């Protein structure tokens with residue numbers, strides 16, 4: 458009854474925002490999602506996602522999509538390999554435990570979430586740029602100059618969100634590591650040496666402070682990521698330009714001098730690199746207790762954390778599960794009370810996940826790390 462005659466808008470059609478939309482919409486709520494992506498066919502860059510049984514799968518199960526997720530997800534083994542190509546350990550998948558945390562492509566996950574929403578729930582090509590209160594309505598202004606209204610706004614537009622101020626003045630901060638991600642489409646044909654090395658499993662390798670991760674089977678593409686402590690020089694004078702593939706390739710081949718040629722072939726065969734400093738949106742400071750109208754944040758917009766403990770999406774899907782339940786479960790007598798309890802709970806499991814992810818980051822990028 459809290460949401461009677463309330464227009465609820467979600468900013469961002471990521472995994473967290475769409476799951477939130479599904480959880481509210483299946484209860485009869487009036488939901489609109491504004492997404493900056495041009496249209497539903499836009500590719501989502503990055504690796505696969507694993508939904509954990511305790512958190513991410515609960516959100517999907519609660520939304521009625523758990524089996525759809527299982528149908529599209531792939532169980533993946535993991536090989537720990539040294540820099541010379543020697544497999545050190547092989548953690549294969551139990552057929553019994555294959556539904557524990559199978560990997561799903563990001564576009565496939567988005568498609569299942571979109572198909573569970575009513576038609577035209579997501580409004581595409583809508584980049585929110587301004588959010589201001591007008592009496593009892595939020596005013597949403599978009600990059601294309603259009604404007605919309607809402608009674609409740611849920612910020613779900615990712616870790617670099619610029620529309621958080623009414624909730625918190627906390628700024629995104631850097632942790633000291635750097636990630637370079639890339640895709641090699643049709644790896645059986647285009648990087649056969651490294652594809653053979655993965656041998657149907659995800660690959661993980663650490664050497665000289667440089668970590669390499671690879672998934673050979675991300676919907677017919679090999680996705681891999683290279684992570685390291687950000688060089689101290691890049692803070693004063695950096696010489697790698699990430700708009701120039703050739704400069705990125707040159708830098709990586711220097712870093713990977715001692716690695717087996719199959720790794721260097723992987724680097725030389727990459728057409729585009731995405732480089733980004735690891736960031737955190739810290740939960741050290743409490744959010745604002747005085748807000749002009751109901752608003753909150755979920756997902757990376759709430760607790761962006763380093764992606765070294767596999768907590769990112771699962772923490773966000775927990776946000777959507779707890780917040781959607783609080784708004785519909787009859788336990789609270791105001792939207793604001795329901796939001797406040799959500800944030801109390803989220804600061805608790807959010808703070809723990811961030812502390813874990815920082816612990817893993819510090820350990821993994823020490824020169825003594827060995828998996």
Ligand SMILES: Cc1cc2nc3c(=O)[nH]c(=O)nc-3n(C[C@H](O)[C@H](O)[C@H](O)COP(=O)(O)OP(=O)(O)OC[C@H]3O[C@@H](n4cnc5c(N)ncnc54)[C@H](O)[C@@H]3O)c2cc1C
Pocket residue numbers: 468469470471472473474491492493494503504505506507583584585586613614615616618636638682755756757758764767768769770771773
């Ligand atoms: C390199 C890397 C690897 C990772 N690996 C994993 C992993 O293996 N497992 C895992 O669980 N997590 C992983 N994560 C973290 C995980 O991807 C995030 O926690 C998760 O994607 C957060 O989802 P979200 O919906 O909150 O935000 P996002 O996934 O960023 O989605 C936000 C959405 O909002 C849209 N948007 C942004 N600004 C606007 C705007 N102004 N107006 C409208 N729409 C807007 C974006 O286009 C996007 O669709 C990784 C992160 C990184 C950087």
Ligand SMILES: Cc1c2c(c(O)c3c(O)cccc13)C(=O)[C@]1(O)C(=O)C(C(N)=O)=C(O)[C@@H](N(C)C)[C@@H]1C2
Pocket residue numbers: 504505507636638670671672680681682683684764765766767768817
């Ligand atoms: C360290 C780690 C990683 C991942 C991960 O899921 C995870 C976990 O679930 C528990 C503990 C540790 C990790 C990744 O999935 C992954 O996203 C990944 O597979 C990966 C990749 N396939 O390229 C990465 O790039 C890695 N990172 C730099 C973002 C990260 C590494």
